[PDB]
Amino acid sequence: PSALAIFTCRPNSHPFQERHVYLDEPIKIGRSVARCRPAQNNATFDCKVLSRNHALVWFDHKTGKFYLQDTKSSNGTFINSQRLSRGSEESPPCEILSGDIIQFGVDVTENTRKVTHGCIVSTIKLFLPDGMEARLRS
């Protein structure tokens, strides 16, 4: 048994393939870098607007709650469009529920050229170690 977060790519997201992220321990969310590349079982994204150490997601095995924390991201982390912390500041742990829309970064139109870079926008579905779906967003 292992708690599980499934990340699926929303229509307004920079593209990524669906992730099946097991949460036996906290998982870093961050930008793809050497030695830390995207994989199905992780929350590492090839996306310009993410920080290397962007956020952290985990399951609290003693209460059955799931959490997301912004770890001083430059461009923001959001739960249902609400920003967890200011730029370059840490948030407290923020509880996430199954069905939340989670966003890392924001779209950025460069100031020096006409290019727009997308951000990661995901639905997250959350499952307890025994397989039952976690508390649902309402």
Numbering used by the authors: 2 to 139
Publication excerpt:
In mammals, the canonical Hippo pathway contains a core kinase cascade, formed by STE20-like MST1/2 kinases, Large Tumor Suppressor LATS1/2 kinases, the WW-domain containing scaffold protein Salvador (SAV1) and the adaptor protein MOB1. MST1/2 contain an N-terminal kinase domain and a C-terminal coiled-coil SARAH domain, which are separated by a flexible linker. MST1 and MST2 can each form a constitutive homodimer through the SARAH domain, and kinase activation is achieved by trans-autophosphorylation of the activation loop (T183 for MST1 and T180 for MST2). In this study, using a combination of biochemical, structural, and cell biological experiments, we establish the PP2A complex, STRIPAKSLMAP, as a key negative regulator of Hippo signaling in human cells, and show that SAV1 promotes MST1/2 activation through antagonizing the STRIPAKSLMAP PP2A phosphatase activity.
A proteomic study has shown that MST1/2 interact with a specific PP2A complex called STRIPAK through the N-terminal forkhead associated (FHA) domain of the adaptor protein SLMAP. FHA domains are specific phospho-threonine (pT) binding modules. Like other FHA domains, SLMAP FHA adopts a typical β sandwich fold that consists of two large β sheets. One sheet contains six antiparallel strands: β2, β1, β11, β10, β7, and β8, while the other sheet contains five mixed parallel/antiparallel strands: β4, β3, β5, β6, and β9. The major structural differences between SLMAP FHA and other FHAs with known structures reside in the loops connecting the β strands, especially the long loop between β10 and β11, which forms a short β1’/β2’ hairpin and protrudes away from the FHA core. Despite the differences of the loops at the pT binding site among various FHA domains, the pT-binding residues, R32, S52 and H55, can be structurally overlaid with the corresponding residues from other FHAs, suggesting that the mode of pT recognition is highly conserved among FHA domains.
